[PDB]
Design a protein around this ligand. Sequence first.
Ligand code: HEM
Ligand code: HEM
Lengths: 442, 442
Amino acid sequence: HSHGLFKKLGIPGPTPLPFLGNILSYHKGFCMFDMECHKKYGKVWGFYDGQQPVLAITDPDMIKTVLVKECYSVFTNRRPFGPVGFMKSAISIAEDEEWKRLRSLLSPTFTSGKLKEMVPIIAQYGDVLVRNLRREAETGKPVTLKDVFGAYSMDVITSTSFGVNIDSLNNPQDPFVENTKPFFLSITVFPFLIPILEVLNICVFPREVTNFLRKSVKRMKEVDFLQLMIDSHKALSDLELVAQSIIFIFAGYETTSSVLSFIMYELATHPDVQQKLQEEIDAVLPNKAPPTYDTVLQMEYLDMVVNETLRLFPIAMRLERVCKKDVEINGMFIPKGVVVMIPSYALHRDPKYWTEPEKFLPERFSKKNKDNIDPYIYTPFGSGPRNCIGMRFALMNMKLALIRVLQNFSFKPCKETQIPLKLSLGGLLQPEKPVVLKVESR
Amino acid sequence: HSHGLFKKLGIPGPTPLPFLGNILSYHKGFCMFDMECHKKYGKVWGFYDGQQPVLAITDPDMIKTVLVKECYSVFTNRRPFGPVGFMKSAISIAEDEEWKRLRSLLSPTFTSGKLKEMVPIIAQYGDVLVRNLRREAETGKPVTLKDVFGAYSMDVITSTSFGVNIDSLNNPQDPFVENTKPFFLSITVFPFLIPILEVLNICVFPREVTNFLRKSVKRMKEVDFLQLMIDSHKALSDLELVAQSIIFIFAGYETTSSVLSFIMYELATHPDVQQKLQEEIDAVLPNKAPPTYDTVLQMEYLDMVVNETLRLFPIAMRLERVCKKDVEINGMFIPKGVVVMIPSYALHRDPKYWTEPEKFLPERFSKKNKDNIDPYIYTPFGSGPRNCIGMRFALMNMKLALIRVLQNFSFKPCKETQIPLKLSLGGLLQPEKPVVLKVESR
Ligand code: HEM
Ligand code: HEM
C-alpha cells in the first residue's frame, strides 16, 4: 500500500482512496484536475493514478532537471500505458538503450533538410483542402472543420508516410489507412491487467490490421517517411520500421486536425488577428502565391498565432517521465518508480507567468516579448532529448495549411459555433462540440 | 508471440506450445529437464517458461561473462517470481542500484570476522541437536533426520537472526517464528497475474504475519544478525531491515536441513567416508572436543564431504540473470528481456567435467584434484557479485552440526531408508521420501 508515500515524504496533495487513488477527481478532466491542484498545493504535489504514485512539478529548474539534465540517467522513459503488443518497438514506447537507438536512427528523417523536400508534396494537399473548402464555400453554409482538416491531415500523412496519394474526403471507400479508428481508467487502477491483455493478443491498437501495412510494405523494400527509413547502430528491422509509421500516423492525424480546429476557432473569434495574419500572408505571398519552405519560416505573425494557440491548447496536456532510481533533484527526494508529471496545460495557463491566461493574445510571442518566456513553462512539444520528434514537421504541416486556407477564405462564427468553446471531457484535448464556422470566399 | 525468438536466433531447444511454452516438460522436474536438454542440445539451448524466453548456457567463459564480467552492466537482476508485496526490499529480490545498496549494507554482517563471533552461539545448538539425538539413540530405533535437523536449523536461525534462544524440538508450542509454513506453475505461464495479487495484498509469503516481527523488532531498536544490521549509502530502514531477516530465515532453514539430510544419507551409505571423516574429526578434536571456528576451517575431509554433497545436490538447481539490454557476449547475441539460466544441477553431473558423476566421491575436491575444477561449472552458491551472500555462514553452520553429530554417533541405513534416494518431484530439491536412518551411540 504505497498510498502513504507522499505523506511519508511531506508532499501535499489529494488523499487517495484505496485501489482508486485520485482517479475519481478526473470527473472534471485531466486539465481541470491539474489546474485545481496547481492552485491549492503550490509548486509540487502528489497524487495516485490507482496505485501508481505521480509527482507533479511546476518549477522550471526542476522541469529542466527532469526533461534535460537527468534524462538519460534517471528520467529516460514514460510509464507503460496498456497492452502494447508488438508496438513496444515504437519510439514513443521504447525504453532506455532500445529507445536511444530508435531516436538516433529516426533523427535524420525529421531534419529541416528533409522537411523542405516534403513541402511541395504537402502543399499539393494544401490545394486539395481549398478544393474541398471552395465546395463548402459557394454552397454558402457552415463547415465542420474536423472533416476537411481531418481529411487534410489524413491526406498529408499517407503521402508523406507512404507516398500513397489519395483524396480522403473524395475517396472514402478506399480505406488505405483507416487503421486509426472505459478502458484506460480501468487499466490504470488495474495496471496488472496490462500484461494480461498482452498474452491475450489484445492490443490497444486494432491488431487484426498492421497485416495490411507490413504486407503493403513488402511493396517498399523492392521522397517520404518510408523511403527515408529504409536507407538506414544496426539498421531498422522490418517490423521495427512498421511500428514507427503507425506511431507516425497516430501522431500526425488527431494532432493536426484538432490544433487546426483550435487555430481556426481562435482566428474566427478574433477577426483582427485573422485579418492581420491574412495581410502578412498576402504581403509575403503576393496574389495568392504558392507557399514554400523558406516563406513559411518568415511569416512571424503566423508563428506567433500557432504558438499562442498551442499555449491555450497543449493537446498532450501533460509531460511524464519515470524515476528509474532513488534520486535527489533540486533539493527534494524522488523515489524509484514514481512518475514525474509536468502539467503543460496548467503551466500554460498560470498567472505566475502569463497575463490574462484565458485570453488569445498572439503578441505574447513577439520578438519583443518572446525572450521573456521560460522554455520549461511553455512545453507544447516537450523538451530535452525526448521532446516531440516531429515538432518541425507538425508546425510546417499546419502553417502550410493555414496559409493556403487564408489566402482564399475568411472565417466567421455561426449560430452553431460553440462560443465559448468547451473542451472535451475525455482525454485527448479536443472541442466538446466540434467547431463549425462560415467560410466566405475572398 | 515471442515463441519464434530462438528459431529466429538459430538456437536449438524444445518447441514451445502456445501459452504454455515448455512448462509441460517439467513433469519430470526442473533438474531432469535441464539434464535431457543439456544432453541433446549441446552447450546452449532455449526454452519458454510460458511466454518468458529462457536461454540456458553451459559454457564456463559465457557463465563467467554472465555472472561476473557483465553483472553490473547487463545481468544484474533475477527475474520476478510472483506477488512480492513489501518483500521487494529483500536483497534477493531487489534490482539494480537498490540491490547494490543492500548488498553493500549487508556485506559486513557476513564477514569471516562476524562468523567467528557466532560460532559459540551456534555450537550451543550443536549440543542441543545431540541432546535430541541421544534421545532417539538409546530409544534404539530410526530417526527422521529432517525433524532433528529441521529443529536444529530452526534453533540456529532464531538465535543468530534474533538472539531468541529456543529448543524448537522441545518447545513446539511457542511459535516465535513459525512464520515459514499449483501456484508458481500458473504464475509463470501467467506472469500477468503477478501484479494482480500485488494490488490484491496477496503475498507469496503469509502476509498476516510479519506484523509479529516488525512489532517484535520494536523490541530491538531500544551478537546476532539483528544487532549487526542496526549499527549501520544511507542506513537500513525499519521495514527494509525486517525484509532481510525474513529472507534470512527462509534461506537458512530449508537449505540447512535438506543439505544435512543429503550429507547424512551419503555418509550412512558410504560408511568408509563416515569413518574416515569421524577419524579426522576425532584427530583434530581429541576426546569429543568442542568445535571452534579455527578448527572447522582445518578439517579438510569435512570440507570435501560438504562440497561433494552440494555437487550432487545443488538445492538452488539453477542460476538465473535477466538480460537488461541487447548485448553480444562471447560470440552470441542475447536480446533484452531474455532470462539467462545456468543449470547448476546439470553441470555438476556432466561427464564432460566429472568422472562417474552419480558417484559420491569426496576425493574430487582433494588438494591434489581440487585445482582441476572450473569455478563456473561447480556453482552451488553461485558466483560473482550476486552469489550466495550467506555462503560462509551456511557452510560453517552445517559443518559445526556434522562434527558434534559424528563426535557422538554413527549412522546406518534402515529397511525404511530409500535406497537409492529419489529426489523430490516438486521444485526445492529435497528427498522424495524423507531420509530415515539408525543412530548408534559411540
Ligand atoms: C500539433 C502537433 C503535435 C504536438 C503538439 C505534439 C506534442 C508532443 C509532446 C508534448 C510530446 C512529448 C514530449 C516530451 O514528453 O518531452 C510528443 C512526443 C512525440 N511526438 Fe508529438 N506532437 C505533435 C505532432 C507529432 C507528429 C506530426 C509526429 C510525427 C510525425 C509526432 C511524433 C512524436 C513522437 C515519436 C513522440 C515521442 C518521442 C520519443 O518518445 O522520443 N508528434 N509530442
Ligand atoms: C546450503 C545452503 C545454501 C546454498 C546451497 C545457497 C545457495 C545459493 C545460490 C546458488 C544463490 C544464487 C547465487 C547466484 O545466483 O549467483 C543464493 C543466493 C542467496 N542466498 Fe543462499 N544458499 C544457502 C544458504 C543461505 C543462507 C544461510 C543465507 C543467509 C543467512 C543465504 C542468503 C542468500 C541471499 C540473500 C541470496 C541472494 C543474494 C543476492 O541476491 O545478492 N543463503 N544462495
